[PDB]
């Protein structure tokens, strides 16, 4: 009641559409605001593509050890290659493990496209989440088109409720085997893109594993799992979207939404 009231207040001020879903595994308390509305997913999908490689492609580290050599063409068409674009990487290639990792920690567009290629395309991600009971989340296009984020578009979307449940199953549930779960979690904990978002809004002594997403129409998302000192983990997702194509994303709205959640949960 009051949680949602504070959130609608943040929404009214920002001029953006706000979608939040958080679940405290300790208390069982949940916070829901536009939790079932669709929002453009953007890079939040990278956690899913990486998880799919782990569950479906890799058996005993065999596939993770494969080295993939890509081209300047791959780097350029992805329109985002923070790690993959480095000369040394472009020169020597990167292993599947490294590519799954940087897809998350640096949100590398090129690394994700390479993983989608191994998976069989964007639909392999939809098939993967569908196997986990998620009937909302869907990936339809490649980088960078999937970030188009038009308000009337239904492709490449998810809901705050859906993605929180799916992320929860991957990190805290049994969607993956123990080894794979530990690998995926280590990548989330190593994220470097949340500085002005969830990491800015949660107390500095709370451990955080998350994945961000930003695209056109001022979309700005953050989804992850956080562990307050001495307490059970909280799975939380904040999706935000605007209606003007070139609107500026609001990092403060995402950080502020997290502040409300930190003061409400844990």
Swiss-Prot record:
SUPFAM superfamilies: beta-lactamase/transpeptidase-like (SSF56601). One of its GO terms (biological process) is beta-lactam antibiotic catabolic process. It comes from the Bacteria. It catalyses: a beta-lactam + H2O = a substituted beta-amino acid. Substrate binds at residues 211-213. Keywords: Antibiotic resistance, Hydrolase, Signal. The active site is at 43 (acyl-ester intermediate). It holds the Pfam family Beta-lactamase2. GO terms for molecular function: beta-lactamase activity. The keyword Metal-binding does not apply. Predicted to be exported by the Tat system. The position of the signal peptide cleavage has been experimentally proven. InterPro entries: Beta-lactam/transpept-like, Beta-lactam_cat, Beta-lactam_class-A, Beta-lactam_class-A_AS, TAT_signal. The keyword Signal applies. Its EC number is 3.5.2.6. Belongs to the class-A beta-lactamase family. The class A beta-lactamase family has a specific amino-acid numbering system, sometimes called Ambler or ABL numbering and often misspelt as Amber. A multiple sequence alignment was used to derive a consensus sequence and then the consensus was numbered taking into account insertions and deletions. This allows use of identical numbers, e.g. for active site residues, despite differences in protein length. UniProt always uses natural numbering of residues, hence there appear to be differences in numbering between this entry and some papers. This is Beta-lactamase. It comes from Streptomyces albus G.
